[PDB]
Amino acid sequence: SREEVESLIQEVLEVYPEKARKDRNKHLAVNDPAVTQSKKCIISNKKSQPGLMTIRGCAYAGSKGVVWGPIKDMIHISHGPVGCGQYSRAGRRNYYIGTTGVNAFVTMNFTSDFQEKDIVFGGDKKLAKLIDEVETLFPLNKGISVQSECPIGLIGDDIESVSKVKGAELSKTIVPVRCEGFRGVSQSLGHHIANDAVRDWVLGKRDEDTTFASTPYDVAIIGDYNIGGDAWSSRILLEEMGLRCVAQWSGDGSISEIELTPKVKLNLVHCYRSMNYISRHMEEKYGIPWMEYNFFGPTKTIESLRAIAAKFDESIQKKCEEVIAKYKPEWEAVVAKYRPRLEGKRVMLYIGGLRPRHVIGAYEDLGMEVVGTGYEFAHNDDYDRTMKEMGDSTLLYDDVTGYEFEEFVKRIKPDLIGSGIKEKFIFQKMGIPFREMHSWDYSGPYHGFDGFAIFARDMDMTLNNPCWKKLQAPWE
Amino acid sequence: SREEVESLIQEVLEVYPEKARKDRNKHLAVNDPAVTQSKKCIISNKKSQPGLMTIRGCAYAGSKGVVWGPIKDMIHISHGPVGCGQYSRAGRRNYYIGTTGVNAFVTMNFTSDFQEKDIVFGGDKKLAKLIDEVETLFPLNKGISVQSECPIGLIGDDIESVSKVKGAELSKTIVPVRCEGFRGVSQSLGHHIANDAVRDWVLGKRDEDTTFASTPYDVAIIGDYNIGGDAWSSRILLEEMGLRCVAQWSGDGSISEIELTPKVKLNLVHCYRSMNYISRHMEEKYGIPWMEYNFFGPTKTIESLRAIAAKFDESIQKKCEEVIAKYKPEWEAVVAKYRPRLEGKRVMLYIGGLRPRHVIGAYEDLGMEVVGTGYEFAHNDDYDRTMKEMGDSTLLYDDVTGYEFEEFVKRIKPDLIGSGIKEKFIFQKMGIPFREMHSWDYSGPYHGFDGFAIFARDMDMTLNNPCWKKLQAPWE
Amino acid sequence: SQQVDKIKASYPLFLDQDYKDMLAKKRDGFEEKYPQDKIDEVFQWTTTKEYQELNFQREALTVNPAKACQPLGAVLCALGFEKTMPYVHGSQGCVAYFRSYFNRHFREPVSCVSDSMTEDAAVFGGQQNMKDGLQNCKATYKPDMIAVSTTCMAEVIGDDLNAFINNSKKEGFIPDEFPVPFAHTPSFVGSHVTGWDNMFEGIARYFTLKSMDDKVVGSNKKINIVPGFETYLGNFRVIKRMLSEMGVGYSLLSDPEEVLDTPADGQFRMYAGGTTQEEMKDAPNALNTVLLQPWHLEKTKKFVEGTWKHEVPKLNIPMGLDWTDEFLMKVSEISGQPIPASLTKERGRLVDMMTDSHTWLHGKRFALWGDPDFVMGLVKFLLELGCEPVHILCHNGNKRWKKAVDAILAASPYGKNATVYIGKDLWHLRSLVFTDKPDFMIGNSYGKFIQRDTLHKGKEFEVPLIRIGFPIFDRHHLHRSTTLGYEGAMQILTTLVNSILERLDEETRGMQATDYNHDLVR
Amino acid sequence: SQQVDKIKASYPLFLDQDYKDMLAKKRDGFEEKYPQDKIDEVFQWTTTKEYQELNFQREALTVNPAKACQPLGAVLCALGFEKTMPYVHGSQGCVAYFRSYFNRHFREPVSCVSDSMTEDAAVFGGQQNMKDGLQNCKATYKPDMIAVSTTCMAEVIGDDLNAFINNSKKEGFIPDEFPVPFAHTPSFVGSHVTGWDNMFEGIARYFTLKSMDDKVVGSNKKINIVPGFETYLGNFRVIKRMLSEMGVGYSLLSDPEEVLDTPADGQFRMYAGGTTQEEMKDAPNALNTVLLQPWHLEKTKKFVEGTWKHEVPKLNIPMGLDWTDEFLMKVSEISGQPIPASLTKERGRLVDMMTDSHTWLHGKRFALWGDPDFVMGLVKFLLELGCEPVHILCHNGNKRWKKAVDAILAASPYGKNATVYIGKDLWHLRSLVFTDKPDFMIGNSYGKFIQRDTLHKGKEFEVPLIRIGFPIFDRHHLHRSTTLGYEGAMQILTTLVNSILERLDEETRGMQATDYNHDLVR
């Protein structure tokens, strides 16, 4: 009930000191589907309170980790000490096709590897030496990007000049990116720093080139990172509907695809938070319109295929119907097999920006109810979009601390919890089935129709696995 | 010294009860290279004293295990209870080339699998049913053989009739073989039972057939079982010398090769004990002469290649010299690398019939001295051949008991011991390097020039392995 | 030819061109081999459903059995006792085979002796061999006890073991007092497990039958544990460790762990550890006797219930999470001792490993074989893991056991595609993996060959073999593993999930083909 | 499309023809990919000697490092203490990354907190975050102790930890008495091992520095053991077990084993076990302090020798037969307690396993990498096994260490082809395995990719990766293994011999091609 959820939020906040408690209450809200504006309900994207165990990453993770890293052709140098590159290597499954170390470099870790000499003297000379070295060793790379670690902003290193000078020397595009971890308050500013970086150094290269032939049906998937091959499953559906996909941002992406993006007629934006900055820019500079779409679950996909097709002519609209017709028996077969298995089961979700709101339809497509949801670093426009999707009196949390999350879960008692890797081991111990939302627990893809069968199957094996019955010892 | 060895033998025999002690002394001798006849020195091939842990196998092992099992095309049925076939399956490495279970069946275990109904009623009806079953399931087999386990002789089963009647029905050769374990006193009578079986049921089939074209250079390797590919390495040398090898008995053998054997001009006999019975028979029936040859170590091989070539014309003799010329730099290189490593090291060997005497030249080629040697089931003619090869006052044992062997080794204290699997673990514990002579410790081949490199390398790694230094704990 | 710097063993020596040419010439010249097309045609035929039917129709021919004879079972059990020498009455070739089969699996010396009965011994009987054998063996090896078992030749001719042993003592060959328990062990009847059961009831019966009046149940306050035929050292070790952890007093009858595991310290030990004669004599004084592998311990259950009056609890082999909980709770009820905090922690960890590895394990299909208790235990555990065992084969199993397993399978939604086969060999299983394909095969080294055959049909049709079971000869020291208890469950869980992950890596290792799924973190 | 009966995951879903066609269209249409021939020409180029020289010529670019930063080292050590919460002063993204790297390797929850310093915090300093952070963290997680470490942003701006922590207490944010040991841990200097060393000397220094007069050496009659940075639970467990077996009293400083291994029993435990504060305070009273991994324990050696006056024995990490013997004898000399019969038997068994598996292991060539102590220990062991370690690489190693290792290699006839490289990454190693080929690679999960590259050149050129080390993310529960002691040696020996046998089987599994050598018994 609303009074009960409100009491639960108040009850939990009692443990925190006053500055932290006062700030946190602004981040916890009982959801009202009716409210138009998020700010009345919840406040978000504010610096995290220290010592409370926030799940948030840094700006480097948002820029190097999510937008830039997935491009296959280019090489990304983590600039600074050895650790950031190391922890983040091959961490995220932005799937790609290529010959690694020869033409594609995604799983590879490239670093300046700062030592103290570099911190005292500075890293520019080294970055230039590293750029020259990168070039002799890996001759087929199509670009280079420098992702700034925290020490770069602090020691006064100018990477723009090195990037500009070397790029000119090598006739190669080098993108300096200032995603220092201290900048911003979450993985979020890094998306913006990364998006802006893409726009200043790589978007306008084929500004005057008219050689590529473009059909009126050309479209670019923006903000789909192909985790587990999500983009590929999403991509085949758009192609079957008759649209041509020129570019993917940035999963399994190539710099050539990105440079060819402005040529496209429409931009389909899957992840609003990460790449909306670039989408708005493209609409202002090139006039290309952008529409948010959802491919999780058969209902959102059908609704999404239908909306995208309307923006096009009747042949496309007709093709859209054939495809929905084609995969209808496949998806309903999945629903028939797994809905009886997952029906009425309550779900709690914590993820960073796009997914807490987005996977709701799929869960509901399986008869699961999402009791509560939250975001690691989402803005209020994200929250505006969220409440309509969330049911009434359901719990909403922004930048939930670890302590708050355990307490909410103990009270609420959800059947299944979808969250990241740090959160997962605590819950399994608690006996609550856990599915990792970020990595799709090494499964996927979860996008599209093909993705939905994997998703239903995954929720069902984890939720109903025999291991949950076995936790209390028989001898009391 | 001779007095010391003689005392050692007397000293060991003190533990045994009188009937056993009286009998055993006949089997232990201090070697005199001078003596022409073995019987003065040692007695052999007598029933083993009970409870003394003799290393000897049964007649089934000699017939099924050594002569028959290696033929690739034919299927061998272990007739009787399930155990004999099971313990012996894929135990011995008689290497062969074929598609197993389809055209070649060596590693496969085929059994009548007697239960009590069979022991009470008898197994003939079952053997016939098994023969019919064998035929439908494995259509490309070129023959069938029935190896009698111990219960066959005892229960009064007549396998000759079933073999004769089915063979006639299937127009397939079925060879009944009476290698009941109780018959004989060692793996030895089995060879004879097996040899005689081959001669009555398979040798004379192409008695009147003259279609196969035969050169004067045709020869058959008799008694080389291709352990670790020994025959193949031996075979390539004879082929390079210009001789043509029609048949191999019985390693990597085929029934077609055996039936074509009598067409050959000369029979080269590697293992005297196992197939001398067949060799003599061939000389009496077909007039084909047989000569014993040794391929272990460069000296025996050169001496052997030379002898075989003399039995042929000058072109062959000339070719023999080219080959010795060709492999001379290879073998001497091995000697140069490994002799300094193995020089002056004393060796003790216990093996069943051909090898104790035969590998002596190879060890000496490496500078190793064989202090003592014995045989599991060797006849006296085998012992007649042995003393010339063995040095003076060296220890000789026939059907050595386990207790006798440990005591002899503790006193003599050899650097390395070559013997079988049962003997190996006891010695390693004692800290004495052990090499298995039967299976070449899963290495080989040890035959020929190519085989010799593997052999020198093998003695060297085991004898000089760092693990022997490590046995006593540092804290005293 | 050999480069002395890098010498080549059979493989890849024969891979050389001169040898390849030679073999071909040999094959073309004298082998009279069927064409490769025919061989191919026949091979594809065996992979089919039509062939499986003819193959499953066999009534007289056994191909590639999953069972061995009784004396093997008897020699292993005899090895469990202190300063005890296994002695087998009958022909010698059997002893050589038992020692070698054991030597290879344990990579340890195995001591065994035979009275060496011959053809002549066949007409007269086994009386001389037994007197001389008993006399010679005792003088030579100094065993405290000699336990007699018999080979099939002896069983068919019908030598009386009891009469022979008594006359040996009576005639003065060996002392009257020297222990000589004996058990008839027909190879045609049963398997090595039955062979193990017979030897044990015989040893238990010899020590405890004459004196029962003095014995009173529960007087010594220890629980007798009878292992059954066991080839994993960790099992003997784990059962002892947990009872020890719980504080429960116990007697493990037939413990072959010290002897099968003696140190290489420069001295050879023929005998190490073992169950003491006194432990065997004072056994009826236990509160209760627990049998670890009940399916092959039936004769022993009859002697222990009837003679010692112990009410043996019905417990399944302590494999998996549920069975081990049941064994511990039961020991707690018999002992009166509580299950300690330490053990409850171990169970927690097993569950944590189960929750941690469940996604990879779920839905995996397995074809497995072995002795009945072990297979039964494994089947129960895989279902607890949510894996799907498609083909279950026990060669030496029976109707009651099959009934027992089907019940287990029926209890779990996971056991739906599962089918139990008994009296069927590995040749039958080969057919099963080819017609209905399991993801994996759990079994002994004999399955190396089934795997080889499947890879032959295709890469995609190959079923990797995971080795758990006996005998294992192609890998080293696996006999040091544990399958019983939480520890055993943990070992089994790690091997299966890692076997599955190892396979996924192989499949996704192709460059720019399947490497998209060749993930760093799984 | 998906058949609901058998759903396909990424692999082999993308292997479907519709998807394959789509990807190709995508590649041809928009990717502007270099021709496959060019990609092939370039890939064959990297496998060469010429490329290795340019690759080894690098002075500024690091590709695929084998080392991580300091705070990782600091967080792990802080985890060793009871009711202790690791706290890292600096930016938050680092904490998320440490928890995740640890979570994946241990598949267990990892608790860590940050004060969350921002851009604004960069100009002003880390003072507010430290007061609020210390106050908030204590109120929320109730840790008995909070141990501070710092992220590079903090190190570069220069926040004073000692001043900040004192002012926090002085201003009243946290009690004066509440323990708050702190260690500066610059990511640019060193590695996670150095990070671990700093955190430990700091914790040890905080508890024991002010009071040393009362402390008298050898008064408590226990031996302090400092583990160093360790990711294998078996290692903490084995060291304790042997000391316990020996009867030696001991204090393990920084024991993270209970917390990294808590049971899933329905309740989440943030804190479990750990080294007690009193254990740390009473430490100087030990007879002596033994450091398990001396190479990264240099700062702690200086504090312990200088302040506590303990004469730390020079002992190598107890890996292998000889180093374990040395560790035990040394403990015996310090404790005064004898090495028990039980431990001597274990050593016996290790040797027996060594004699048993020597022929397969002999002469095998290995390329291996890791932290310096572990690598050093592994190299010593391989040589003890007669294996040949061709390429030894320690990224975070040094000149003294390299000198120490070369000495070890010089002592054995086995280390002839061996070469030690320091400061060289996995990219360097990839080149090495391609130019001079090892039979095997021993290392962490990062080598899965080197293996993939080799198989790409060809089947025969592939170097299978054997995983021992940290981090291991593609296999489950390997962190439960042991590398220390006899037990550790046994585990390592079994993995190496079996890795070798597993590979031989794969190579000889081809039908009528190489199966002649596909033996049942090995």
Ligand code: CLF
């Ligand atoms: S001498 Fe075979 S293992 Fe033995 S008890 Fe019989 S079933 Fe069993 Fe020779 S023929 Fe064979 S090998 Fe022995 S067994 Fe007889």
Ligand code: CLF
């Ligand atoms: S916020 Fe990198 S792990 Fe950290 S202490 Fe620095 S070297 Fe080490 Fe962000 S940019 Fe990176 S991820 Fe952190 S580190 Fe800064």
Ligand SMILES: [Ca+2]
């Ligand atoms: Ca051994």
Ligand SMILES: [Ca+2]
């Ligand atoms: Ca865990």
